[PDB]
C-alpha cells in the first residue's frame, strides 16, 4: 500500500527479471548435469 | 532400465503375428514353427545410454 512498499515491490520484480536469465541458464546447467551424471553412473552423495 | 517379460502376444493362428512383431523389432520373419517362439524385444533408451 505503501509508496516504499510499491517501490520494494517494483524493485524485487525488476530483480526477478533480471535474474530469469540467470535462472534460465542454472536450469540448463541444472539439465546438463542431470544428464552427465546419469551417463557416467556418478552416483550422487548420500547426503547430497 | 529394469528387465523382466515382456508382451506375450497370446494372439490367434494364420495371422502372422511372429510378422507383426517381427516387423515391431526391426526384423522381417513371419515363420512361425510349433508352440512357442521367443523373440527379443531390443529397446535402446539414450536417455541415459
Given at each position: 500500500?505503501?509508496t516504499?512498499?510499491?517501490?520494494?515491490?517494483?524493485?524485487?520484480?525488476?530483480?526477478?527479471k533480471?535474474?530469469?536469465?540467470?535462472?534460465?541458464?542454472?536450469?540448463?546447467?541444472?539439465?546438463?548435469?542431470?544428464?552427465?551424471?546419469?551417463?557416467?553412473?556418478?552416483?550422487?552423495?548420500?547426503?547430497? | 532400465?529394469?528387465?523382466g517379460?515382456?508382451?506375450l502376444?497370446?494372439?490367434?493362428?494364420?495371422?502372422?503375428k511372429?510378422?507383426?512383431?517381427?516387423?515391431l523389432?526391426?526384423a522381417?520373419?513371419?515363420?512361425?514353427?510349433?508352440?512357442?517362439e521367443?523373440?527379443?524385444?531390443?529397446?535402446?533408451?539414450?536417455?541415459?545410454?
Amino acid at each position: 500500500a505503501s509508496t516504499s512498499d510499491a517501490v520494494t515491490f517494483i524493485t524485487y520484480v525488476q530483480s526477478l527479471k533480471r535474474k530469469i536469465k540467470q535462472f534460465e541458464k542454472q536450469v540448463e546447467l541444472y539439465r546438463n548435469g542431470q544428464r552427465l551424471l546419469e551417463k557416467q553412473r556418478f552416483q550422487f552423495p548420500p547426503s547430497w | 532400465l529394469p528387465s523382466g517379460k515382456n508382451i506375450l502376444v497370446f494372439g490367434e493362428d494364420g495371422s502372422g503375428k511372429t510378422t507383426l512383431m517381427t516387423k515391431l523389432q526391426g526384423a522381417e520373419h513371419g515363420k512361425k514353427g510349433r508352440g512357442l517362439e521367443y523373440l527379443y524385444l531390443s529397446v535402446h533408451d539414450e536417455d541415459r545410454d
